[PDB]
Design a protein around this nucleic acid. Structure first.
Ligand SMILES: [Mg+2]
Ligand SMILES: [Mg+2]
Ligand SMILES: [Mg+2]
Ligand SMILES: [Mg+2]
Ligand SMILES: [Mg+2]
Ligand SMILES: [Mg+2]
Ligand SMILES: [Mg+2]
Ligand SMILES: [Mg+2]
Ligand SMILES: [Mg+2]
Ligand SMILES: [Mg+2]
Ligand SMILES: [Mg+2]
Ligand SMILES: [Mg+2]
Ligand SMILES: [Mg+2]
Ligand SMILES: [Mg+2]
Ligand SMILES: [Mg+2]
Ligand SMILES: [Mg+2]
Ligand SMILES: [Mg+2]
Ligand SMILES: [Mg+2]
Ligand SMILES: [Mg+2]
Ligand SMILES: [Mg+2]
Ligand SMILES: [Mg+2]
Ligand SMILES: [Mg+2]
Ligand SMILES: [Mg+2]
Ligand SMILES: [Mg+2]
Ligand SMILES: [Mg+2]
Ligand SMILES: [Mg+2]
Ligand SMILES: [Mg+2]
Ligand SMILES: [Mg+2]
Ligand SMILES: [Mg+2]
Ligand SMILES: [Mg+2]
Ligand SMILES: [Mg+2]
Ligand SMILES: [Mg+2]
Ligand SMILES: [Zn+2]
Lengths: 155, 144, 87, 151, 25, 81, 129
RNA sequence: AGGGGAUCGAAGAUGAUCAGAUACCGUCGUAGUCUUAACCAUAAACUAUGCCGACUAGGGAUCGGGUGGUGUUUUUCUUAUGACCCACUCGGCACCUUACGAGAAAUCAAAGUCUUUGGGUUCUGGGGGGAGUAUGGUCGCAAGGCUGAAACUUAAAGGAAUUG
RNA sequence: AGGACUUUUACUUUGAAAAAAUUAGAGUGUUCAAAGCAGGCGAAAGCUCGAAUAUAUUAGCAUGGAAUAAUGGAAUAGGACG
RNA sequence: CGGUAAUUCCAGCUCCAGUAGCGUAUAUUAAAGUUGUUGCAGUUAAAAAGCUCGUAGUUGAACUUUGGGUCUGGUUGUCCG
RNA sequence: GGAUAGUGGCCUACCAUGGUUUCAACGGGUAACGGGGAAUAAGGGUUCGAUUCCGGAGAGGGAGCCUGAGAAACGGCUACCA
């Protein structure tokens, strides 16, 4: 779901205020800026040497992670640059001393550094309001597959 | 064991089952539908004034032979017309035609009481004064 | 049963079925108390000395009174191998 | 005594003997038994018939007692396990047979109901084998495609 | 009365009302 | 009945009850060593066999499938295992 | 389908006690049944039971002495806060001087008095008295 | 709709019974009954007892299967079957006795293991009538099916059993 | 106090938090009480104890436990260590 | 209850209940185990879909360290200082 | 990119076709302001909470705005409707 071109749209895609000097003769790829969101969260190497831009990247973009940390399961990865996470829980009705299965749908914004798909459990973190509905940035794909790590069977 | 589920995660169906069964009662159905406001002569009202249209007496049932002295009153709050009961012995003459009368409930939850058919309201006050004060000659009708 | 001073306050400790350890009601008008006479060396029933078994009304009504008495008498050395603990 | 799809309450079964180890009187070799199992499978036999043959013609009480592995497990170690598990395959065989009988005579409604029952059982077993990833997650039973798997 | 015949009379009333509505539908 | 051993019931009662219903459930079946008059090979067969078992040397059946246990052939001699 | 095995065990105990017997044969014999009967032994409501290995979930033979009068499971193992223990004891036990709400804590399966002594509470298993 | 078309028989035709009798008794008698396609989805569709699971009490029988008999007739010389006889077991429609359990009882071996109240789970009821009516959906060619109140009225309606 | 890996829960104990008024409840002769948060004691020459506590049963945070209930490992070894 | 002896209507007498309060009307709570999670009923009283399959929901067999010995800390009832 | 004090489909331009839902979304009703709380009381609960405290909203219904740090103010203005 990611275009091969590093910028595909009409506007140029740059990380704002990080400048690579062409008059200099180092001729490295670029000057890519990055940061670690803390909380003992490892910045992915795909972000460390990646070439995407993703203004709202917790690792490369301007957005900062602070506040709630929610673990959920991916229910929809098929809307661009964003994720829809199903969070399940049990509401305790006290008149019966019984619990009640319930679910909420938390939108979030998964960076291109992560490769997500329907069913991956995901650790996500709070941030600024990014869109009308997304307020969380995907911080870790704990279960990349879960039960698809071993696929074939050749004895 | 029993009809209801018992699992620790069955709060939802227990609650909705109780919520669907609650409509079997009459008090709950009346309270939630709010039929009192829409259909009853008074909308959740203990008392209501009205104007006497005419002056009727209604026969009793089989086991009781008499004619209970009623009065047809058109309610002023909304315009409905209901029969009402003039309670005591010599109080029929006390209430004259086309005077304001304050009807009250008949004490049987809006249902006909005793042997009087098709009546559901007493008479407590007439022309601003109470019937009980007139019946013991403590006060007199203003006659306005 | 026991007052804090240590004095008994119960009206009476009830008997218990010698076969099922269940207590015997005051008005349990089916229960029985069997007496089996002690026997000396020459087969003379020694008088006033015996062994008592209180069978409840419940087992009697059920139909297991004789079997329970068989086992209970075999345990206390009255009958020889009349009852086998393994059916 | 459940009989998932009928009113039956039977309990006709087999009682596995208490001793897990090999019977004292058995003289055959575990390697020979595994070779026999492999040869029977190469003949084109499902594990159940293999167990039946080893129990009748030979002293094999059961493979797990003698070898330590199960018959399907032994076949899978050698890569002879069928792509479709045997019980599900037999269910599809029965379903296609009943569908053939139906399309050759329409008015039989009892066999129509029995086909419904068999298809329900097929769906249940397919769901199980799909949640254990024995079958691919895209695997499904369809009336038109069942014949190809059976044939 | 039997519930059967009360039901049948209700059905006949529905007959009349249905034909009336059909004539005026 | 009121007092009774279940850990050690009489072996007669053990053979009395159904399989799957003993203290420990054990099969009532057994294996047999059969000799066919043809050759001297000893074949191990099952009491409740389900197939027309034959000796590998000669195409002669030694058992016959039956609703219950195997019905042996006429002249084959067996010993219980 | 056998859902709550402890329910079957305690029901068998109750049936074999009301009829006055001195033994029960419980078939499935899980951990929880063993711990339940061990608590009952510790408090005396039961006699001398026995585990019979089957290689097949095992079984249990229970010896009684008529001292018990009723077992019983609270089939939905309700989360019981330490405040609600007294509520369950009042609702289940016949008197405050005896009876025991057998409940499962993080420190094992214990009678309610022992759990109150450890000042720990968990889910409720059943009741004996 | 197409095929058949014997019997029996809604409607109808009459002959009787009666005060009336287009009801019961009788004689004819279309539609229907019988079918191939397409609809219908309701019955006192009843065991008026939801399904799965465990335990609790004695007695015989009966159906299907399986085990054993030093069993009996069978006859094919003996045997193998089969058919019985005895014992046991699994499963099924059932049945008798009893309360030591349950019920308001009639009664139930489940309608037991329920104030000593919790094995899992689905559907339904909250006095009677109005009423399974109206309306609104939805299915049906139609018949009608599914869903389905209120206004109002009423002190009872109802269950089992006892004596007359 | 730093890199390092953290199976994930449900559950439960303890604590921080859940504004005051209200409820509970301690002290206190408003003449008793409803109340109120007052008051008490000196020789009469200023000396004083107060304005206590608990609960809220959900959501969040920390914490000890690991029975009960659920999920995950190593089956093509692409497994664990040196 | 009242149809010629009204312990029930209208009064007089006596008495009863609460008492500066008491009576009525509607609403609501306990009674209501007549909303039943604790805690209801379904053979006949109202109530088991005609039967079966089946997604969601609810629920779901047993099994993975139990023992022991010592030392040692608080809290008890101990015998007495 | 514009606007915002500032994030934000908050608005615009160009793209993608997406988001919620039998765990009841959406719609309808509320003689519904939410809560702290009140009545009731074996335990579980049922009903009420317009009102002495905390929040929110409103000044006849609607929109629009100047001044200021703070108003879409109404015992401030502008207009329409009544
Ligand atoms: Mg025709
Ligand atoms: Mg005629
Ligand atoms: Mg005639
Ligand atoms: Mg005729
Ligand atoms: Mg004829
Ligand atoms: Mg019907
Ligand atoms: Mg029915
Ligand atoms: Mg009704
Ligand atoms: Mg009706
Ligand atoms: Mg309609
Ligand atoms: Mg009757
Ligand atoms: Mg507070
Ligand atoms: Mg107070
Ligand atoms: Mg008189
Ligand atoms: Mg009821
Ligand atoms: Mg009836
Ligand atoms: Mg009925
Ligand atoms: Mg039914
Ligand atoms: Mg499902
Ligand atoms: Mg389990
Ligand atoms: Mg409110
Ligand atoms: Mg309002
Ligand atoms: Mg308020
Ligand atoms: Mg208002
Ligand atoms: Mg305010
Ligand atoms: Mg304002
Ligand atoms: Mg005004
Ligand atoms: Mg200023
Ligand atoms: Mg304004
Ligand atoms: Mg003003
Ligand atoms: Mg102002
Ligand atoms: Mg101004
Ligand atoms: Zn040979």
């Amino acid at each position: 779901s990611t275009e091969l071109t590093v910028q595909s749209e009409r506007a140029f895609q740059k990380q704002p205020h990080i400048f690579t000097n062409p008059k200099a003769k180092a001729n490295r790829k670029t000057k890519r800026w990055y940061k670690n969101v803390g909380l003992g969260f490892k910045t992915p190497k795909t972000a460390i040497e990646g070439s995407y831009i993703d203004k709202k990247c917790p690792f490369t973009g301007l957005v900062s992670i602070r506040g709630k940390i929610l673990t959920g399961t991916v229910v929809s990865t098929r809307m661009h640059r964003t994720i829809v996470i199903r969070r399940d829980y049990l509401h305790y009705v006290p008149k019966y001393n019984r619990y009640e299965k319930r679910h909420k749908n938390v939108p979030a914004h998964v960076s291109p550094a992560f490769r997500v798909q329907v069913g991956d459990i995901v650790t996500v973190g709070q941030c600024r309001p990014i869109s009308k509905t997304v307020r969380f940035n995907v911080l870790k794909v704990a279960s990349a597959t879960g039960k698809a790590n071993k696929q074939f069977a050749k004895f | 064991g029993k009809g209801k589920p018992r699992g620790l995660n069955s709060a939802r169906k227990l609650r909705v089952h109780r919520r669907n069964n609650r409509w079997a009662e009459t008090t709950y159905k009346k309270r939630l539908l709010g039929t009192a406001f829409k259909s009853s002569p008074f909308g959740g009202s203990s008392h209501a004034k009205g104007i006497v249209l005419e002056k009727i007496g209604i026969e009793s049932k089989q086991p009781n032979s008499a004619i209970r002295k009623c009065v047809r009153v058109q309610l002023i709050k909304n315009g409905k017309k209901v029969t009402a009961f003039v309670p005591n012995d010599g109080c029929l003459n006390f209430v004259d035609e086309n005077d304001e009368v304050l009807l009250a409930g008949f004490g049987r939850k809006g249902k006909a009481k005793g042997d009087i058919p098709g009546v559901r309201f007493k008479v407590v006050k007439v022309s601003g004064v109470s019937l009980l004060a007139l019946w013991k000659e403590k006060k007199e009708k203003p006659r306005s | 049963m026991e007052n804090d001073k240590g004095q008994l306050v119960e009206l009476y400790v009830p008997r218990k079925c010698s076969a099922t350890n269940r207590i015997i009601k005051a008005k349990d008008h089916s229960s029985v108390q069997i007496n089996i006479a002690q026997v000396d060396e020459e087969g003379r029933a020694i008088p006033g000395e015996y062994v008592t078994y209180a069978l409840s009304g419940y087992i009697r009504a059920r139909g297991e009174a004789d079997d329970s008495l068989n086992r209970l008498a075999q345990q206390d050395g009255l009958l020889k191998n009349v009852w086998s603990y393994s059916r | 005594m459940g009989r998932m799809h009928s009113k039956g309450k039977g309990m006709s079964s087999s009682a596995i003997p208490y001793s897990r180890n090999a019977p004292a009187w058995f003289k055959g070799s575990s390697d020979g038994v595994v070779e026999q199992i492999i040869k029977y499978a190469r003949k084109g036999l499902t594990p159940s018939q293999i167990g039946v043959l080893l129990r009748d013609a030979h002293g094999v009480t059961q493979a797990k007692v003698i070898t330590g592995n199960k018959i399907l497990r032994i076949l899978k170690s050698n890569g002879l396990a069928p792509e479709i598990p045997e019980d599900l395959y037999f269910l599809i065989k029965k379903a296609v047979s009943v569908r053939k009988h139906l399309e050759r005579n329409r008015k039989d409604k009892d066999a129509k109901f029995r086909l419904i029952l068999i298809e329900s059982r097929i769906h249940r077993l397919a769901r199980y084998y799909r949640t254990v990833s024995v079958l691919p997650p895209n695997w499904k039973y369809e009336s038109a495609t069942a014949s190809a798997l059976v044939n | 009365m039997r519930a059967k015949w009360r039901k049948k009379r209700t059905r006949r009333l529905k007959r009349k009302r249905r034909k009336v509505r059909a004539r005026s539908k | 009945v009121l007092v009774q051993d279940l850990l050690h019931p009489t072996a007669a009662s053990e053979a009395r009850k159904h399989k799957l219903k003993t203290l420990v459930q054990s099969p009532r079946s057994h294996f047999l060593d059969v000799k066919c008059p043809g050759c001297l090979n000893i074949t191990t067969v099952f009491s409740h066999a389900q197939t027309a078992v034959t000796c590998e040397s000669c195409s002669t059946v030694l058992c016959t499938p039956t609703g219950g246990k195997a019905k042996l052939s006429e002249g084959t001699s067996f010993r219980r295992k | 389908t056998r859902t709550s095995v402890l329910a079957d065990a305690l029901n068998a105990i109750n049936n074999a006690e009301k009829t006055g017997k001195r033994q029960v044969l419980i078939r499935p014999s899980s951990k929880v049944i063993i711990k339940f009967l061990q608590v009952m032994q510790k408090h005396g409501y039961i006699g001398e039971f026995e585990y019979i290995d089957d290689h097949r979930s095992g079984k249990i033979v229970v010896q009684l002495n008529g001292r018990l009068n009723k077992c019983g499971v609270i089939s939905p193992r309700f989360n019981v806060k330490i405040a609600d223990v007294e509520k369950w004891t009042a609702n289940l036990l016949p008197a405050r001087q005896f009876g025991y709400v057998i409940l499962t804590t993080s420190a094992g399966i214990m009678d309610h008095e022992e759990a109150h002594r450890k000042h720990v509470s968990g889910k409720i298993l059943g009741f004996v008295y």
